[PDB]
Symmetry: D3
Subunit: 137 residues, 6 copies
């Protein structure tokens, strides 16, 4: 019952990559435990990126992640956290390999189309912050 | 502007068809105004299929629609209601033509994989019943 | 329960369409009850097209059907016979509609890429002719 | 032998549909006899839509067709003209059936993603107008 | 004329991955020399896994590989043996890279969807054991 | 505005891979700045391969690259040159990884389906040689 948090960023949404991306996770055999379209608020954004509150790129993050609606979801399955990270590819598309989501769909780090939890703790932290308990199935 | 209600029934979600179906609507050019995985409550199911509360197939109709989680969504675009109706194909998969969602994915009427609002009127009602106002973007 | 006979003719196999066509039937929800690559013997071809043994196009009809290996299979499911007929599209690719196998892959009647049993009766006969009983699962 | 003129209009190219549409024609079995990305000149657009020079929608019709680059091509094969017409679907995306190019990708008549010669006569004229003789292979 | 033996395991079959998997090998350009749906018998299973007859996981192998019908095939082409191994990805899906068959479709080692010959000798050994001479084309 | 030169070789063209290949670059987010079907002349071929004029494989190159029409194009985007090289995969298909173009579509070095500029200089050199200034958009 391991699980991870994934977010198709605003760029992934306006480019129409929601279905294709979900399709990869479904054919992979992972379970969709949660899923919803949403608009991240400024305050919520700054919270998710709380640790980087001091970083210089922080403003740019909050601005982009709230530039439009996003699709949040939770996937379940064996080693899903490390597995989804592997499927997504390197954070910067130029280093992501063909076959991965960022390697096949993205070209810039600022708009790398997607995000996945780095660790199980980060997953819990992120799941609690974007989903109400009744939204997990 | 125009909006329609779409639902990938429990079989569609069970069979891992959520992404492929979503992708079709995105490729068509429609916008995802709302989206979420949810378990239909016995109450919600009854208020939805109230039309057939007298029919003898109502018990099973409801049982099925709540047998597993579903994916509700709202599509927005030029005549999105009739277009989605056409894209899903006839209700009974036997009459649905290839290239159509039911015609490509469904095999029996009991499990026709998907539902789309029948008219503008049904759209407003169905959307208000499955979605809280704040969930529409 | 219900079963139909399907054959990806020599052109379909030559053109590397076996997988794509198979995938369509699996996505539709049908079950593969039998499957095999085989070279049609002059005898088998004659017993299959016995109907047109008098016609002047029979010689070429047979020559072609044995010009290369083919993929015979048996699909099983709710009204699989008529459904497969619909999925293949009209015999003459000119009349076949897009989304249909012949409508998407074929260009001429001589090479219509695929054949599917016309009726339950044809299904039983064709299956018994192309398949040894132990090959059905 | 037979040849038809096809054009992925500015919206199709803008939306990144060139490859998917091309792939459909290749899977169908047609041959690419000519292909090129090009910006339609105001002159070329007028000579193409001369038919509607009187209509009041002509100004916008031309403006749009030159609003961005397009992909012109020539398909060759057995009755390629009528087949391509069928594959594109009705002009008005509302009437186009799923599995059809316009039926799967277009949403409005203004931007119907693609154009294909209406008859053999239109084909010859359109090809000669969009292509220099040496460009046909 | 080098060749290898491939088997889409029971899990690959019930999940409907037969077509998609074959499609990858066809678009790759390999030739399908043999292909058939079959039910592996207990004795046959134990033979294929003869070497591991002493291993502890042996019982689990025979049990799973006979849990349902499988699709056996033979592919031909330049360095096809090492190539198909590369396409399949690491034996354990968690180590297989995105783009490979196991990396895109599997999550557990016990049900890694597919098998390919490790060496040419293993190929011959496996081809002789699952195919009759007349089944190779 | 960085850009690279790509050529789908004769084998890629006759195998019908033009659309699929373009589709990968479009979903990647790169821009098609130039595109056209063409027949490379002997002299032109020898020029593009000028440096290898002394090599032993030179004759084989000119012969194959002129064996049929090819599709030339120019792609624009962030680090597109190194990125397209990465997408294409190793020059010899046997070393190209699954997910890349050569790794998924090719089996032999002589017919590795595609070519991309090795450096920016090579891109300019190749763009000038295959496209007239008015063909770049
Ligand atoms: N299996 C089955 N379901 C039926 C039958 N008649 C009606 N239904 C169900 O009743 C519902 C009809 O309501 P409707 O809003 O039209 O649903 P739609 O099929 O999505 O258009 C659908 O969920 C049907 O599947 C029947 O004869 N057999
Ligand atoms: N090329 C061509 N084939 C024909 C013609 N008339 C009949 N046939 C062939 O005869 C066979 C008719 O038998 P049938 O069992 O109906 O095959 P089906 O096309 O798979 O339904 C098919 O293989 C046809 O392709 C014709 O006028 N031209
Ligand atoms: N938006 C819009 N376009 C129209 C209308 N009537 C004609 N047209 C355009 O006029 C052209 C008709 O020429 P035609 O050669 O038939 O183009 P086709 O749509 O590719 O078959 C098409 O580009 C149409 O989109 C209309 O009522 N609305």
């Amino acid at each position: 019952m391991e699980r991870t948090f994934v977010m198709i960023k605003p760029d992934g949404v306006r480019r129409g990559l929601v279905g294709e991306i979900l399709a990869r996770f479904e054919r992979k055999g992972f379970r969709i435990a949660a899923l919803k379209l949403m608009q991240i608020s400024q305050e919520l954004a700054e919270r998710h990126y709380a640790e980087h509150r001091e970083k210089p790129f922080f403003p740019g993050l909050v601005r982009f992640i709230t530039s439009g609606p996003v699709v949040a979801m939770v996937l379940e399955g064996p080693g899903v956290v490390a597995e989804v990270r592997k499927m997504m590819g390197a954070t910067h598309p130029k280093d992501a390999l063909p076959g991965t989501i960022r390697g096949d769909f993205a070209t810039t780090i600022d708009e790398n189309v997607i995000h996945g939890s780095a660790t199980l703790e980060d997953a819990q932290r992120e799941i609690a912050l974007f989903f109400r308990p009744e939204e997990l199935l």
